């Protein structure tokens, strides 16, 4: 019911917006009536469609059993089996909640073609949401790569000055790396004749073949989180992509890599994952430490936030490769907490400052608290969330991820605690400068945060603190789903 309704309804929504806005192309040269107020009616229809998608997952959430082991809502549609568990359910809801936020963040800061942008946003959201409910490797890859087509055009049309560089980077870094993941999927379909999740989870392959399959998949996953040294696409893509593209990229697209570990590595390549964990920890720890020190020297506001996202997703990778429930739950909570804080920091840095001054150079901004006090409150509040200050979901995710690493590997997992210091070094260096000293001589006094931008900031802050104070809303759903990923034989 879920997948069938989520696809059929959105196709009707896509066709409806095309029919209304393209009925007058034929040398009418008219003035229409939907083109008024920057295509307000067409924007409103797409905004409504995004909210309705959140209602569809809710109807299937009411019947979700947290005390059932296995996939639920098992459905067949387009010759593909679709199912949900505790892990998938939360990631689907996170993906769909950000849909309205992506549209509303670009409500009035596009030069034109609002119908195209709204369709692409709703198209990106559904394809990413469907990626959490597929039940085979090939369906995972189809949805993993289908987002590249709209994302490539979204950046190149609505992007910043270096959009051409950013569009090529996202298309080539992600497509080339995922084709290595396709090689591993083809091998599974050749030797086992199926790519079904449950079917492949029960098969033990030779330790040499598991190594080759792990490397193929990890290449696709490592580029998309991203990890060092294949991370160089992300800062360029984030600084040039539109605000809605940055929100979806920083809120959902990066979380597909962690879900890739949960599906494509842990239950099917269990023996070889234990072998690779020290290598994963070394790569991730250096990803965390290097990205934090590199973030210090950055001079672009939207690139600083982009490098901040890489540091925290290294911690998510460390937690998910811990072989205990504490690390796995911590990595998942950190994924959800990051899914709200990171888009909020892009709205503050690339959606409020950029929409007023159209410059992302750090040297132009200081003392903003004198004439933008409301902006400074949200900037300061989200900065402490971004560094894992307690009472925030980020801390609960970070503390359990660090604890899970220590339990997994006491010696090298202890280096993960540098996230506490290093994240505060670069994040509070930027915030201390935007809110420090006299109001900048290079800026003219203008409006403070508007009602729309207050609304976006409030509804990204609220879930972060609710999860931070009472994470059992999330841990109860994840408890039985996460316990299946642990591999150990104690005697």
């Amino acid at each position: 019911m879920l997948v069938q309704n989520l696809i059929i309804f959105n196709i009707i929504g896509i066709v409806l917006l095309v029919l209304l806005n393209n009925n007058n192309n034929g040398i009418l040269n008219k003035k229409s009536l939907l083109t008024i107020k920057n295509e307000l009616k067409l924007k409103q229809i797409g905004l409504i469609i995004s909210i309705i998608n959140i209602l569809i997952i809710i109807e299937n959430w009411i019947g979700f059993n947290s005390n059932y082991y296995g996939f639920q809502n098992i459905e067949r549609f387009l010759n593909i089996y679709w199912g949900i568990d505790g892990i998938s359910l939360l990631l689907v809801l996170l993906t769909l909640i950000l849909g309205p936020i992506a549209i509303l963040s670009n409500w009035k800061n596009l030069k034109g073609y609002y119908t195209y942008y709204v369709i692409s946003i709703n198209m990106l959201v559904i394809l990413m949401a469907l990626n959490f409910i597929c039940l085979d490797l090939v369906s995972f890859y189809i949805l993993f790569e289908s987002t590249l087509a709209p994302l490539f055009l979204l950046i190149g049309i609505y992007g910043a000055n270096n959009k051409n560089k950013a569009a090529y980077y996202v298309l080539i870094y992600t497509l080339a790396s995922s084709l290595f993941m396709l090689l591993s999927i083809v091998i599974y379909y050749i030797i086992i004749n199926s790519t079904d999740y449950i079917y492949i989870n029960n098969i033990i392959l030779s330790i040499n073949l598991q190594s080759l399959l792990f490397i193929g998949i990890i290449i696709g996953i490592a580029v998309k989180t991203p990890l060092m040294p294949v991370h160089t696409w992300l800062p360029t893509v984030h600084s040039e992509s539109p605000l809605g593209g940055s929100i979806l990229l920083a809120g959902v697209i990066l979380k597909l890599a962690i879900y890739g570990v949960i599906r494509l590595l842990l239950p099917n390549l269990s023996e070889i994952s234990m072998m690779f964990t020290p290598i994963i920890y070394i790569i991730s720890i250096l990803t965390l430490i290097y990205s934090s020190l590199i973030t210090l020297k950055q001079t672009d506001l939207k690139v600083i936030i982009a490098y901040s996202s890489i540091s925290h997703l290294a911690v998510c990778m460390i937690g998910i490769f811990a072989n205990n429930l504490i690390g796995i739950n911590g990595s998942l909570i950190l994924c959800l907490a990051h899914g709200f804080v990171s888009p909020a920091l892009f709205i503050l840095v690339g959606g409020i400052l950029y929409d007023r001054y159209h410059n992302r150079l750090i040297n132009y901004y200081q003392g903003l608290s004198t004439f933008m006090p409301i902006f400074s409150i949200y900037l300061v509040v989200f900065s402490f969330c971004n560094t894992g200050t307690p009472l925030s979901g980020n801390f609960v995710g970070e503390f359990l991820s660090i604890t899970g690493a220590v339990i997994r590997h006491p010696i090298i997992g202890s280096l993960t605690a540098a996230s506490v210091l290093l994240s505060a070094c670069y994040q509070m260096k930027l915030t201390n400068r935007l809110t420090g000293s006299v109001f900048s001589q290079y800026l003219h006094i203008t409006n403070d945060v508007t009602n729309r931008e207050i609304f976006l900031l409030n509804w990204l802050l609220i879930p972060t603190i609710i999860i931070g104070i009472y994470p059992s809303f999330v841990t109860n759903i994840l408890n039985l789903a996460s316990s299946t990923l642990i591999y150990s034989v104690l005697i």
Partner: protein, 90 residues
Amino acid sequence: DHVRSPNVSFDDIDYNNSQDLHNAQESLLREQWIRVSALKVCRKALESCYKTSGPNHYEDCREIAEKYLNMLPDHRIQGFLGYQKNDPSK
């Protein structure tokens, strides 16, 4: 109502039976969560004994503390994949 664990071992089933392997996987998960429940109850006894005994906690709670330190290494979730995919006797 309160569902119950379908006690089913990997050692007594054919994995080609999809529903039987599902039960053995669930059966092993539910027995590990109960041991986590038992460990927390034992830790509850340790905390109450420590608070009440005051300076007598070393002697009064000695066997409770000894039992908690023994159960802690293995009264945690281990997953079903480890025992499903490994035969200890071979």
